Every structure is written in C-alpha cells, then in structure tokens.
Amino acid sequence: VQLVQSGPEVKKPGTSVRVSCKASGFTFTSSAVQWVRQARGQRLEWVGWIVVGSGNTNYAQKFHERVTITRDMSTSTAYMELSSLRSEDTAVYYCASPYCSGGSCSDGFDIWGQGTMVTVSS
Amino acid sequence: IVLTQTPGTLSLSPGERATLSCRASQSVSSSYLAWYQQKPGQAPRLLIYGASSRATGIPDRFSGSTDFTLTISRLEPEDFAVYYCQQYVGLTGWTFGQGTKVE
Amino acid sequence: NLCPFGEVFNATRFASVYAWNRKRISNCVADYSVLYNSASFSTFKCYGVSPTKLNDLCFTNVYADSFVIRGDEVRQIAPGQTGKIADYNYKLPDDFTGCVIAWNSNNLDSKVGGNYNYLYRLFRKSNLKPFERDISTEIYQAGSTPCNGVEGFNCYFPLQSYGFQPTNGVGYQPYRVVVLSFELLHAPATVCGP
Ligand SMILES: *[C@@H]1O[C@H](CO)[C@@H](O[C@@H]2O[C@H](CO)[C@@H](O)[C@H](O)[C@H]2NC(C)=O)[C@H](O)[C@H]1NC(C)=O
C-alpha cells in the first residue's frame, strides 16, 4: 500500500507543469486524491482534489482558474497540471488518498506520496 | 474557512505531555477534522481523524478529542514534529492550519 | 399479431443503464429474423439459443431490457462478466438465455458539447443480483461516517454521466443495447416465431 509520485520538475515562468501519482497495493479506483503544496519553511496549502471513480474535481479558490486535476484508470494514476506558473509557485507538491479495499475506505488520508519539488525559474 | 493553530512553537522536554490547539472560525463537523504529523523532510502522516479516532499505526502516546485539540499523553524523541490540522468539510474549501512546531 | 419490436428498437429515447427499461412482450409473434438479418447491428450475440432457430423455440415471456452504454462497456453485457456495468447497473445471470443486441448510435445520441443525459452507477454497497434494478440516488458512504444528505469526503453521488461527443473514439461512442431475455415458465408459452 503506497502512492508513488513522479520526479522533480524545472519549468519557466508562464508555462505549465504536469505532476502525477501512481497508486499501488489498494483499490485506487474507489479512492480519492487530494493535492497540497508546501513551500520550504511554510505551512501546507491545499490545492484541490479529485474523486478517482467519478472524475469530479474541486479546487482551492487561489489556484482554481489555472489548475486542472485529472486521472486515468488504466495506469491507476492521478494527474495535476498547474498552468501559468509563477516564481512564487515554487513548492513541493504532495498527493494523498484514503486506503480502499472492496467497498470500504478509510476516514482520512493515510496514504501519502513522497513529494516533488517544482521549480519556477530562469 | 480559517483554521487557527496555536502555539506557533511549543517547547517542552521529552517525557512530558502536551496539548495542541486548532480553532475553527465556525462550528464544523467533528467527523471531518483531522491531525497530521510531519517529521521535517518527509511527507506528513495521519494521526487523528474524525476529531477523535486514531489512525492505523498510531500508539497510545496520542489521542484526539470549534476547539479541537491533539492530545499527547507523552512525548518521545520521535514525537517532535510539526503538527497540522485539516478540515475536509464539504466538497471544496478544505484548509490547513499554520502548523505547530513541537521541540 | 406481430410483437412490437419497433417500439423497442426505433424508440426516440432510451433509458440510462442505471435504470434500464424493461418491456414485457407477450401473446404475439416474434419475427426474430427481421432483427437477425437486418445487418444494422454491430453486435448480435445469442446465449443458450441459436440465432437462426429463434423462431422455432416458444417462450412464456420475452423481456426487452433497453439501455445506453458506451462502446468499451458493451463486452460487459454477458453472463459471467464483471465490471462497472456488469456489477452495478445491469447484471446477467451465468445461465442467462436470450440474445444481446447492440448498435452504434453515435450520430443519434451524441451532442455538441457532450450529451450528459445518460448515467450509470459507479458506487454501490454490493454487486447486483441478476436482473436487479437499483435506481436509488442515495449518497454513497465510502467511509464509516453518515453523509446525512451532504456530499463531501467519502460521500459521493452514486451516478455519473457519460460524456457522449461527436468527436469521441469508438470506445466512447454510445451504443443502444437491447437484451432479449427468454423466459420459459410453467405456462402456455405465448411468444413464438411465424
Ligand atoms: C426500425 O425502422 C427501420 C426503418 O423503417 C426498419 O428498417 C426497414 O425494414 C423494412 C422491412 O424489412 C425494409 O424494407 C427497409 O428497407 C428497412 N429500412 C432500413 C433503413 O433499414 C427496421 O426494421 C425497424 N426496426 C424494427 C425492430 O422494427
């Protein structure tokens, strides 16, 4: 039971970044994935979440306009893309999900990815 | 919503007990509030969910409870970490508190 | 006195798969050869019966269970299968007898911008029994906490729509599916071929 996150990224200001998390060991298709980001030395900020089965998404108002979360059942993978990157966006992004087995899921986000640094720079 | 997490820093030696406080700006369902522990350099893990229930793997050193707290019955060297509260109420507007650093 | 297949196959609207429309056919002549040799179907698969001998075997009832699903899911409408449709919307028994008929209706059902009037069940507490029709809209509780009518974490609306669009690849195009279930009971056997 793990959630394995993609590697680090370096992007220019104004471009988009694609980050993803591949689930294994649990019923990914019955779970939900939330994304948060953390600047170094700062608090966790919530970005948004997706219900894996439904494909339904909700986003924090701060990023809403430029953030999209999707998923693909065939690879048990959740994806997030943040458009129009700003220098201030530099942060470590994390993904998390509840543990699901059969028809039952846990009541909180027990499974966390490792975190990927995304750098916005010249 | 705004979750106010206090103290900024809690200084307390090992072997002692501590209480961390996350104050909601409104009444919220206890069922959707949770506490996380982030050992620096690592992704956070769930400790308490539903305000009072222990997450799997959480020892009796910890327990749960607008005023939500994390109860630490006793501190061991590995229990010194930044603790965060999270609110899952509704479909959107989920938030985290500032995080309490316990030393 | 022919059976009203036109009312099933040439219907303006089809039911969502989560709430399939069961039409009972009785006391009539079922000219099955019209359907079989129409060559307008992409799928015509018979179980327990030979597709060219359908006229000779009489049944107590014929049930036409009509619904819309997407192409990739057509393979789930079969006995012994599992999956989102096979388990949560419409399940056939392992000993199912009858024929599964389906055709590509992309140019009829897809809309510009997406036709979202067709729904299927994603979340259910358990799998369906054969021919069970569950049309409840109660919020699914994935966790141990009651939803109390409110959607949120671990609280999901059980149904989701199909995004049927004119630009979809075949696997995502809509198909109209009619399953003709052949039931033989202690009965006079009223439906036969010509
Ligand atoms: C649905 O309607 C179509 C159109 O009327 C029917 O197809 C016709 O059937 C007659 C009789 O065999 C043929 O002479 C026509 O050439 C067919 N037209 C087309 C376009 O195929 C069809 O049989 C009807 N379906 C059912 C179940 O009655």
Residue numbers in the entry:
A (entry chain H): 2 to 85, 86C, 87 to 123
B (entry chain L): 2 to 66, 70 to 107
C (entry chain B): 334 to 527
Task: Tell me what the authors wrote about this structure, in their words.
Severe acute respiratory syndrome coronavirus 2 (SARS-CoV-2) infection is initiated by the trimeric spike protein that decorates the virus and binds the ACE2 receptor. SARS-CoV-2 infection is initiated upon attachment of the viral transmembrane spike (S) glycoprotein via a receptor-binding motif (RBM) to angiotensin-converting enzyme 2 (ACE2), leading to membrane fusion and entry into host cells. As for all coronaviruses, SARS-CoV-2 S is the main target of neutralizing antibodies (Abs) and a focus of vaccine design and therapeutic targeting efforts. Two mAbs, S2E12 and S2M11, stood out for their high neutralization activity against authentic SARS-CoV-2 virus and two different SARS-CoV-2 S pseudotyped viruses [using either murine leukemia virus (MLV) or vesicular stomatitis virus (VSV) backbones].
To understand the mechanism of S2E12-mediated potent neutralization of SARS-CoV-2, we characterized a complex between the SARS-CoV-2 S ectodomain trimer and the S2E12 Fab fragment using cryo–electron microscopy (cryo-EM). The concave S2E12 paratope recognizes the convex RBM tip through electrostatic and van der Waals interactions. Specifically, S2E12 utilizes the heavy-chain complementary-determining regions (CDRs) 1 to 3 and the light-chain CDR1 and CDR3, respectively, accounting for two-thirds and one-third of the paratope buried surface area, to recognize residues 455 to 458 and 473 to 493 of the SARS-CoV-2 RBD. Nearly all the S2E12 contacts with the RBD are mediated by germline-encoded residues with only one out of five heavy-chain (G109) and one out of four light-chain (G94) mutated residues contributing to the paratope. The Y449N, E484K/Q, F490L, and S494P RBD variants led to decreased S2M11 binding to S, whereas none of the mutants tested affected interactions with S2E12, although several of them are found in the epitope of this latter mAb. The structural data indicate that both S2E12 and S2M11 would compete with ACE2 attachment to the RBD, as they recognize epitopes overlapping with the RBM.
